Amino acid sequence: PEGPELHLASQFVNEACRALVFGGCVEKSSVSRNPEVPFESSAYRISASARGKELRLILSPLPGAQPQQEPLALVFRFGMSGSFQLVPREELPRHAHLRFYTAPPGPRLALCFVDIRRFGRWDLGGKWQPGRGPCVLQEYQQFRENVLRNLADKAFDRPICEALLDQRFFNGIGNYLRAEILYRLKIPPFEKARSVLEALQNPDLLELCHSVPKEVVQLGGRGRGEEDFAAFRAWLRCYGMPGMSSLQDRHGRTIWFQGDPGPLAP
DNA sequence: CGTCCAGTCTAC
DNA sequence: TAGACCTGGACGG
Q1: How many CB atoms are located within 10 Å of the residue A80 CB?
Q2: How far is the CA of A202 from the C1' of C11 (A)?
Q3: Nearest-CA residue to the C1' of C4?
Q4: How far lies A63's CA from each of A16, A26, A46, A257, in Å?
Q5: Residue A250 CA to C2 C1' — how many Å?
Q6: Is A20 exposed, middle or buried (0-12, 13-18, 19+ CB in 10 A)?
Q7: Is there contact between A174 and strand B, defined as CB under 7 Å from any strand atom?
């Protein structure tokens, strides 16, 4: 999951939890090496916001709930397979590693953080990850200025296809968005990042870093349904597609592209 | 049965 | 940098 999936996950949590009251504890699987959430409340609501490739849940006790409690914020990273699901309390999916339980009256549900591969992480404290740059979806102007003001950073010595994964500057861009972004402008993936970025000191590369992921968000989904899956595969122009070339960057990750690999190709 | 493929994080 | 962390779904034999 990339920025769009984190964003759609946060919309899922806000819409699905809008009229639910949670109660009790926050239960973690025995196999998850992530920390226990020390939170109990007889009546609380769950809300979410995304920033880049991170999501923040707020656990908000209702007036009078017991035990007394201040709101608790948790921040999640999804790694390669994370997602949120609202399931019936006795029909936990496999790999549901953190669980929030609806209070009565009404059907007993569980909001679940599901993570097949367990590369996902959560931290106590509502803080965004120090060092992550602004959200390409929700903080576009800050995102743009943070890149153009820091082209001296040795980050921009690297191929543009590698620079685009650096979450210090492109918080929310992953392996599918970098292919899709570079394909829209036919920028060779192994062009030097500083070359492509100095040259903008109709839409440019930093605009597409925002407008391309925004397109995915506008498809709908909930972190991505088995028909909204078809919508996504059809939107894709480059990542995985017949007729496209592919190489490994210096971190063994696969960049998809058409035409010139570019000057810094291995 | 087997291999290969699909975002960080951290010990050299 | 190269492993490391994980599971499962495509395939190949």
Answers
A1: 12
A2: 42
A3: A119
A4: 21, 19, 14, 54
A5: 11
A6: middle
A7: yes
Tell me the CA–C1' distance in angstroms for A63 and C4.
Answer: 46
* Cα dist from A117 to A36, A81, A165, A248, whole Å: 19, 6, 20, 22
Closest nucleotide to A80 by C1' from CA: B7
Question: Are residues A108 and A89 in contact, defined by beta-carbon separation less than 8 angstroms?
Answer: yes
Contacts 24+ apart (CB under 8 A), A38-43: A38/A124, A39/A69, A39/A72, A40/A67, A40/A69, A41/A65, A41/A66, A41/A67, A41/A69, A42/A66, A42/A67, A42/A103, A43/A103
Resolution for this experimental structure (Å): 2.6
Other Cβ atoms within 10 Å of A206 Cβ, number? 20
**Distance of alpha carbon A22 from alpha carbon A26, whole angstroms:** 10
Q: Is A146 annotated as contributing to ligand binding?
A: no
List the catalytic residues of A.
Answer: 1-2, 53
Q: What is the 3-state secondary structure (H, E, C) of chain A?
A: CCHHHHHHHHHHHHHHCCCCCEEEECEECCCCCCCCCCCEEEEEEEEEEEECCEEEEEEEECCCCCCCCCCEEEEEECCCCEEEEEEECCCCCCCEEEEEEECCCCCCEEEEEEECCCCCEEEECCCCCCCCCCCCCCCHHHHHHHHHCCCCCHHHHCEHHHHCCCCCCCCCCCHHHHHHHHHHHCCCCCCEHHHHHHCCCCCCHHHHHHHHHHHHHHCCCCCCCCCHHHHHHHHCCCCCCCCCEEEECCCCCEEEECCCCCCCCC
Token pair 């509502």 is at which residue?
A126
Report the length, in residues, of chain A: 266
